Design an enzyme around this catalytic site. Structure first.
Site, short mmCIF file in Angstrom:
data_model
loop_
_atom_site.label_atom_id
_atom_site.label_comp_id
_atom_site.label_asym_id
_atom_site.label_seq_id
_atom_site.Cartn_x
_atom_site.Cartn_y
_atom_site.Cartn_z
N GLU A 47 30.93 45.07 50.03
CA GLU A 47 30.05 44.24 49.21
C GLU A 47 29.53 43.13 50.11
OE1 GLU A 47 32.44 44.90 44.93
OE2 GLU A 47 33.09 43.44 46.46
N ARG A 102 43.81 37.66 44.52
CA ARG A 102 42.50 37.04 44.30
C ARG A 102 42.73 35.68 43.67
NH1 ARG A 102 38.74 42.41 42.50
NH2 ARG A 102 38.45 43.10 44.67
N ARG A 155 32.45 40.61 33.67
CA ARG A 155 32.81 40.64 35.08
C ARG A 155 31.53 40.67 35.91
NH1 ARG A 155 36.70 43.99 38.61
NH2 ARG A 155 35.83 42.29 39.90
N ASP A 157 36.35 49.02 35.30
CA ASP A 157 35.09 49.48 35.87
C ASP A 157 34.68 50.74 35.12
OD1 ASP A 157 35.69 47.60 37.92
OD2 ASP A 157 36.29 49.18 39.34
N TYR A 181 35.53 37.61 41.91
CA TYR A 181 34.10 37.72 42.19
C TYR A 181 33.42 36.42 41.79
CZ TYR A 181 34.12 42.78 43.24
OH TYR A 181 34.31 44.03 43.80
N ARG A 205 32.55 42.05 52.61
CA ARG A 205 33.96 42.38 52.36
C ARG A 205 34.36 43.56 53.24
NH1 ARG A 205 35.74 44.43 46.29
NH2 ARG A 205 37.72 45.48 46.85
C1 LIG Z 1 30.81 50.52 40.95
C2 LIG Z 1 32.19 49.94 40.89
O1 LIG Z 1 33.15 50.60 40.49
N1 LIG Z 1 32.29 48.66 41.30
C3 LIG Z 1 33.51 47.86 41.25
C4 LIG Z 1 34.24 47.88 42.59
C5 LIG Z 1 34.62 49.28 43.07
O2 LIG Z 1 35.47 49.88 42.07
C6 LIG Z 1 35.31 49.32 44.44
O3 LIG Z 1 35.35 50.69 44.85
C7 LIG Z 1 36.76 48.83 44.53
O4 LIG Z 1 36.82 47.41 44.77
O5 LIG Z 1 35.47 47.19 42.46
C8 LIG Z 1 35.42 45.88 41.85
C9 LIG Z 1 36.61 45.09 42.14
O6 LIG Z 1 37.06 44.23 41.34
O7 LIG Z 1 37.22 45.33 43.22
C10 LIG Z 1 34.35 45.49 41.10
C11 LIG Z 1 33.15 46.41 40.91
O8 LIG Z 1 32.59 46.33 39.58
#
Ligand SMILES: CC(=O)N[C@H]1[C@H]([C@H](O)[C@H](O)CO)OC(C(=O)O)=C[C@@H]1O
Ligand SMILES: O=S(=O)(O)[C@]1(CNC2CCCCC2)C[C@@H](O)[C@@H](O)C1
Length: 660
Positions: free
Chosen positions: A505, A583, A209, A234, A617, A521
């Site tokens: 992000e 998505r 990912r 995650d 992503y 975002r």
């Molecule tokens: C550090 C971490 O957890 N990053 C993750 C992020 C996060 O959880 C967010 O708070 C909720 O989107 O979420 C996502 C996601 O697919 O949405 C990917 C990231 O890898």
């Protein structure tokens, strides 16, 4: 193949009317093992449709059939059913298909192996194994009681066309044999994509990912990614950061290496459960890295890579938000440590890794080396590694007999860091051939605030200076990390945003010298942006882009400034799902810059594949030959139905003329 087909046909058009091939196929079927090889397009599929059916078409036997079916979500699967035997098998996997590429219907290559000897049904699509299921009671697909129809583009149940298909079957072959995995790999493909990272590669992660791409000054193109071991979850989990590069404009990619790795848990390729009882199983005692970003430094020529770092059992859900994990003594920040048996953190790591005792201010006989490993009197301490398995029917994490260097981020360590999230950096001096041992960045928002979260993708190297910027987010703001000395020292530039607890992000482009636009975002269903005109010192208020939809929760957006003019204007390219439902509906959006006021006219939208097919992503970069490379999650990485899919992070090459 080692045998010839018992049936071969092609150029079948499926236009909501099935084609009967019974007379050609049914008397050729023999024995209990079969392989179906099918090349097919479906760029406007119905909601649910069968490509191929074998059925008992007679009254009273509606539940006696085999089918290969697909959904307009991209999901592929089979049904194998026989009412008399009391068997109703349904196997499938989401996000297995392509629909369109460069405006053209994609020829998908599907191979289904029904193997009576191993009692196993295996499905491949486009050279990717999407499922392999073993059963206690095997049902051969042509041993279904009373089969009297072989059908393309529907299943004949009680004389009526069910699951009517729209698409085409350009080639179909059937064999009275279960062809081997090795033979499957010889079947020619017509894929519009390639894999950079993949199941079974050097990382031994079954899942990936968070892709990144960055074009280096040598012409090498570098990619980073989360190599995720415990399914697609995650952190908390086991995750390492892997990298691969291309020296030929993305045509071929190097075998991956690790940029950031922990070894408290084994690197295992595991088939993570996807059923509703176990799919949320999560590796809960491993340290991990997550969300990486890359930049190149013009001054030193070094490549720099940052990522979040999570101590054992920690992720963003349980990270201590009120603790940076550092102690401030004078104007300096020192990593805190808790020793086995203490209920408080009574230690710190000082200069030269000397472990200091805060309660008595004596130095100890312990030191922390450059890999954050614990030494006692200069000798390496170790801990026993863990491995995971589901042999007992649920997730187990247990010692495996192997010793590894004792790391302060580990569960079993004598000295342990604060259970919160950090950011680390590593550097490469050979453009991604090897990576240094990582260093933690200092805290930016004080002693009692957890670290910010790295925005995955690219950092920004400014064109007219040596300034390096990495965007990060936390509650209430974007926190840009800025370095003017090759990442040796960093300072923050905070930019307030009108959402609290957002996943903001953010990715940046330099519109012109010293002018940075950041796209990010939000929680509003619209992508936002803000502008800096002093190389990131200060930031404008936040605006929004209309014309692109995201979901309420949002998805990462990647963004580049194109080096060439388009329609006579400077161009910015965004990559994002365009959908308010999930998505999916991946697009590249081309924006032309209005020089008078730096506004952007979003003029072209390029549809990466069908609106209903997954896109999450993403990473985009201008390749040295001015094509665009896109590495992206081709599935819905938010959906709780599409967890733990292998080989869904994919790479394509596009030209600007494809986009316009
Ligand atoms: C550090 C971490 O957890 N990053 C993750 C992020 C996060 O959880 C967010 O708070 C909720 O989107 O979420 C996502 C996601 O697919 O949405 C990917 C990231 O890898
Ligand atoms: O302009 S840079 O910021 O150095 C960069 C690369 N530019 C070259 C210009 C020449 C063609 C290929 C891309 C853009 C970012 O997306 C990174 O890929 C790095």
């Amino acid at each position: 193949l080692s045998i010839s087909p018992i049936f071969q046909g092609g150029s079948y058009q499926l236009n909501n009317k099935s084609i009967d091939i019974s007379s050609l196929l049914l008397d050729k079927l023999s024995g209990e093992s079969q392989t179906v090889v099918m090349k097919f397009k479906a760029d406007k599929p119905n909601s649910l449709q069968a490509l191929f059916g074998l059925s008992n078409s007679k009254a009273g036997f509606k539940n006696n059939y085999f089918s290969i079916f697909m959904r307009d979500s991209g999901e592929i699967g089979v049904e194998i059913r026989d009412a008399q035997k009391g068997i109703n098998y349904l196997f499938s996997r989401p996000a297995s298909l392509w629909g369109k590429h460069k405006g053209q219907a994609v020829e998908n290559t599907l191979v289904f192996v029904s193997d009576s000897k191993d009692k196993t049904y295996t499905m491949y699509v486009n050279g990717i194994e999407v499922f392999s299921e073993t059963v206690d009671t095997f049902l051969p697909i042509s041993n279904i009681n009373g089969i009297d129809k072989a059908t393309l583009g529907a299943v004949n149940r009680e004389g009526k066309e069910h699951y009517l298909a729209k698409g085409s079957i350009d080639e179909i072959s059937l064999f009275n044999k279960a062809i081997s995995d090795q033979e499957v790999s010889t079947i020619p493909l017509s894929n519009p994509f390639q894999l950079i990272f993949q199941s079974g590669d050097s990382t031994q992660a079954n899942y990936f990912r968070i892709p990144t791409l960055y074009t280096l000054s040598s012409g090498r193109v570098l990619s980073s990614i989360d190599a995720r071991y415990g399914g697609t979850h995650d952190s908390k989990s086991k995750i390492n950061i892997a990298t691969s590069y291309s020296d030929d404009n993305g045509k071929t990619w190097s075998e991956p290496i690790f940029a950031m790795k922990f070894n408290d848990y084994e690197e295992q390729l595991v088939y993570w459960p996807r059923d509703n009882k176990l799919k949320n199983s999560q590796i809960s005692g491993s340290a991990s890295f997550i969300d990486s970003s890359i930049v190149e430094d013009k001054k030193s020529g070094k490549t720099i890579l940052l990522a979040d770092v999570m101590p054992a059992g920690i992720g963003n859900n349980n990270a201590n938000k009120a603790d940076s994990g550092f102690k401030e003594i004078n104007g300096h920040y020192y990593l805190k440590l808790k020793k086995n048996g203490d209920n408080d953190f009574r230690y710190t790591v000082r200069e030269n890794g000397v472990v200091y005792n805060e309660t008595t201010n004596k130095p100890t006989n312990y030191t922390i080396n450059d890999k954050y490993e614990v030494l006692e009197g200069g000798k390496s301490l170790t801990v026993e590694q863990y491995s995971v398995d589901f042999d007992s029917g649920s997730l187990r994490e247990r010692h495996n007999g192997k010793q590894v260097p004792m790391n302060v981020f580990y569960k079993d360590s004598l000295f342990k860091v604060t259970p919160t999230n950090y950011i680390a950096m590593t550097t490469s001096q050979n453009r991604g051939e090897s990576w240094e041992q990582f260093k933690l960045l200092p805290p930016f928002l004080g002693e009692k605030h957890n670290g910010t979260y790295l925005c995955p993708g690219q950092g920004l190297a400014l064109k007219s200076s040596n300034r390096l910027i990495f965007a990060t987010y936390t509650s209430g703001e974007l926190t840009y990390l800025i370095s003017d000395d090759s990442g040796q020292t960093w300072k923050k530039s905070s930019a307030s945003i009108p959402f609290k607890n957002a996943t903001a992000e953010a990715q940046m482009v330099e519109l012109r010298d010293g002018v940075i636009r950041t796209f990010f975002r939000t929680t509003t269903g619209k992508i936002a942006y803000m502008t800096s005109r002093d190389s990131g010192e200060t930031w404008s208020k936040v605006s929004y882009i209309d014309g692109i939809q995201q979901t309420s929760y949002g998805t990462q957006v990647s963004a580049i400034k194109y080096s060439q003019l388009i329609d006579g204007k400077e161009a910015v390219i965004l990559s994002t799902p365009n959908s308010r439902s999930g998505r999916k509906g991946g697009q590249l959006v081309v924006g032309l810059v209005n020089k008078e006021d730096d506004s952007i006219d979003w003029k072209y939208h390029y549809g990466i594949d069908l609106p209903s097919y997954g896109y999450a992503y993403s990473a985009i970069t201008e390749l040295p030959n001015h094509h665009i490379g896109v590495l992206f999650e081709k599935y819905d990485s938010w959906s709780r139905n599409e967890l733990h899919l292998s080989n869904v992070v994919q790479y394509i090459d596009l030209e600007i003329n494809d986009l316009t």
